[PDB]
Design a protein around this nucleic acid. Structure first.
Lengths: 529, 105
DNA sequence: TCAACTGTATG
DNA sequence: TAAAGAGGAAGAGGACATACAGTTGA
RNA sequence: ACCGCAGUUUGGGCGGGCAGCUAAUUAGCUUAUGACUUCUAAGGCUUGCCUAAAAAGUAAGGGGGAAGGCGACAACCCCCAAAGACCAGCCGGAACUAUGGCUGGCAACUAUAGUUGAAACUGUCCUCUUCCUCUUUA
């Protein structure tokens, strides 16, 4: 799927409407988060009962085995020191791993009170110093007494209006499409929070007045109208909007694509509409996918209807996949990231980095210093005059902050464009790509590397090569920068970027060569090419 | 082996007493507390001679918990001679508590 | 009286 | 040159990109 | 250098662009991580003159009128111009240099023949971490 980003112009009334909608969305975010945190207790209790059962089963299986090995197995986890056991005892150690974390408990006689979360969804919970968990409800309306079991229960405008009236706030003017979009964002964040395979995703955070929602998401339908002759887009909740983009008709390509969803976005550069487009066949595929729960509920997974649905889904997906495959020349490349060159190639090509972004970063640093000095002087004058209330920001300071924000946006956009171009070039030229990076240098360099966005480059190149029908590899990095590629022997470097092979049997003996080229050749060889 | 505490004797028990003392604030009707009771029982035995352990029931010494800035149960306080050397809140796992003590001893 | 919006179901 | 606060951003890296009933209103 | 405008970026395009040297208010070379207006805390040379953080503002296609601004300037009116530069194929191991060459058509400019018309675009949400500025202590 692709996203087309089109600049639009809004009137003052439309901007006021947008601000009001974003405020309502922030309120909804906070309400949903409070409800979800209140509700996590039941999930944790079910998990705990299951874990107690698992510890009991591990205990029974450990005790029912012979007494000779079980004592050492228990001590293995009960003592920090761990000797090199035999396979027989190691198998039991693994088979009773749940002892590596917990020990049996009754979990009986508890009153399931609401719990407070920490940095993880299961461990570290505490109950604040009697009242069993109870569900919240919509105060009144047509849906009085409905328990808010899940967050999807909050997708009701009537109940949300009842809550707003209970809190003495005006009724919502925001449409339900954007409510659904915000709820989708929250659901994704919470699922990331509870997934153990992710160890950097944690509890979602409340949003203060300085961190309001900046986007409206409609994930239910495409824009109501896209008038291409008159340059107008009619979307939900607003009067018609004017488009001030010159190439949008050509990029959108509305005669061969299919609009699915959209988002109204605000950036320092202006207001945008992002339209998601996909292959025409997609609309069939989804119609079948959403139909699977029905047949699975009506005929069972073993029925012929299920098999027919799966076959048709596979057929459509294969057609979509083959809709974007390009025949190649079967050229293989080894790529090595570098310090002077962003990427180096197995045949001597050193690509220069995005040197224009460094200047933007320096400009940002200077402007930040200037703004901080100005703020310090203003605060000193405010205090001297004799006031204790918090200060109100000035117009010059607002202008300076706007400039800093625009520079940040420009740097991000420049990096994005450079990475897109390089990824497209590499995808077009080569069919098989071998990629490996040696980040040992990290053990200011971080300042330089934070601006090259190598991970984004690699991700784009991987995606684009896969779509075209190519192959992408990530070979191991063991002994790549210090190994002669035509000999495999460890050589020496006579410069900051030069390398020479050692043994006299080498064909390139005593011939300086670029180190990056050698690393690229080694990566290519380790990829089977 | 762990020493049951009381409100009357806390000052001498946990401050004048020599060596570090790991006091756990415990309540029966809680889940995470029942999750870690075995682990504290184990640690009281493994580290015996290197760190003493203690328990205070917040339903039977209500005035002690507020004083030391404790709000949620369970809570672990490693006291050392008049002051809280280390503090922790949450039903840690075995590895977490073990590394915690190893760092704080 | 038909397009657009709101409620239900699933993941 | 070093370390700890507060505030403003970005980079990493994983997902995501709806279908039908039922109701309103110009 | 930098700033504003062309969907977003790079090479370019129109406009703004401190100071010094040189030549003849207007053209070249070095060069500033923008330029200008108003009023001030402060500082310098000697009672006057200079430089000025902060604060509040102005303009950023060409030309001619023009209510009104302390000023940079300008609501409104008339004429001229129109670059983030055209379309479709085929080669290319496409770097250095942010994509080179050929073929056909179509535009614009020169003298029926020549020159120019460069590339790319999948964004949003979230949680962590990093970078920077300024402070306090060391």
């Amino acid at each position: 799927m692709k996203t087309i980003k089109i600049k639009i112009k809004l009137t003052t009334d439309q901007v006021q409407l947008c601000d009001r909608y974003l405020e309502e969305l922030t309120w909804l975010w906070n309400l949903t988060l409070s409800n979800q945190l209140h509700n996590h207790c039941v999930t944790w209790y079910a998990w705990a009962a299951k874990l107690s059962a698992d510890l009991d089963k591990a205990t029974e299986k450990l005790d029912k085995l012979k007494p000779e090995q079980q004592q050492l197995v228990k001590d293995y986890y009960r003592t920090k020191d761990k000797p090199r056991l035999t396979k027989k005892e190691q198998e039991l150690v693994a088979k009773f791993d749940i002892f590596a974390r917990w020990s049996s408990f009754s979990l009986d006689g508890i009153i399931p009170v609401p719990l407070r979360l920490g940095n993880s969804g299961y461990e570290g919970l505490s109950c604040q110093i009697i009242v069993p968990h109870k569900y919240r409800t919509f105060p009144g309306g047509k849906f009085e007494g409905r328990e808010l079991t899940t967050l999807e229960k909050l997708d009701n405008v009537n109940g949300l209006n009842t809550l707003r009236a209970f809190q003495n706030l005006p009724d919502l003017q925001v449409s339900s499409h954007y409510i659904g979009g915000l709820l989708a964002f929250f659901k994704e964040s919470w699922s990331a929070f509870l997934d153990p395979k992710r160890m950097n995703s944690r509890k979602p955070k409340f949003k203060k007045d300085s961190d309001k929602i900046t986007t409206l998401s409609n994930n239910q339908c495409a824009p109501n109208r896209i008038d291409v002759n008159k340059n107008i887009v009619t979307v939900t909740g607003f009067s018609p909007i004017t488009i001030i983009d010159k190439n949008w008709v050509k990029r959108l390509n509305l005669s061969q694509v299919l609009p699915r969803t959209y988002m109204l976005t605000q950036n320092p550069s202006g207001y945008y509409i992002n339209i998601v487009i996909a292959h025409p066949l997609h609309e069939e595929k989804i119609a079948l996918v959403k139909k699977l729960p029905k047949v699975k509920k009506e005929f069972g997974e073993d029925s012929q209807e299920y098999e027919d649905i799966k076959s048709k889904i596979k057929f459509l997906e294969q057609q979509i996949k083959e809709s974007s495959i390009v025949k190649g020349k079967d050229l293989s490349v080894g790529i090595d990231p570098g310090v002077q060159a962003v990427v180096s190639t197995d045949h001597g090509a050193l690509f220069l980095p995005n040197l224009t972004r460094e200047r933007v970063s320096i400009h940002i640093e200077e402007l930040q210093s200037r703004l901080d000095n100005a703020e310090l002087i203003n605060d000193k004058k405010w205090k001297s005059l004799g006031n204790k209330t918090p200060r109100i920001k000035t117009k010059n300071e607002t202008k300076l902050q706007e400039k800093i924000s625009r520079l940040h946006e420009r740097g991000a956009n420049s990096s994005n464009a450079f990475n897109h171009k390089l990824s497209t070039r590499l995808s077009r030229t080569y069919e098989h790509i071998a990629w490996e990076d040696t980040q040992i240098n990290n053990l200011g360099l971080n300042w330089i590397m934070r601006q090259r966005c190598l991970s984004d480059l690699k991700a784009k190149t991987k995606q684009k090569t896969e779509n075209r029908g190519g192959n992408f590899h990530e070979p191991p990095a063991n002994y790549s920068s210090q190994t002669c590629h035509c000999c495999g022997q460890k050589g020496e470097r006579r410069s900051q970027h030069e390398f020479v092979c050692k043994n006299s049997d080498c064909k390139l003996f005593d011939i300086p060569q670029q180190a990056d080229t050698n690393a690229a050749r080694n990566h290519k060889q380790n990829g089977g090419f | 082996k762990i020493i049951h505490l009381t409100d009357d004797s806390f000052d001498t028990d946990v401050l004048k007493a020599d060596g570090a003392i790991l006091v756990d604030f415990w309540a029966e009707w809680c889940g995470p507390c029942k999750m870690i009771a075995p682990i504290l029982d184990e640690i009281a035995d493994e580290y015996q001679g290197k760190l003493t352990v203690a328990k205070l029931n917040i339903d039977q010494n209500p005035g002690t918990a507020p004083k030391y800035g404790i709000r949620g149960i369970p809570t672990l306080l490693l006291f050392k001679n008049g002051e809280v050397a280390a503090t922790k809140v949450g039903a840690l796992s075995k590895g977490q508590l073990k590394e915690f003590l190893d760092a704080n001893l």
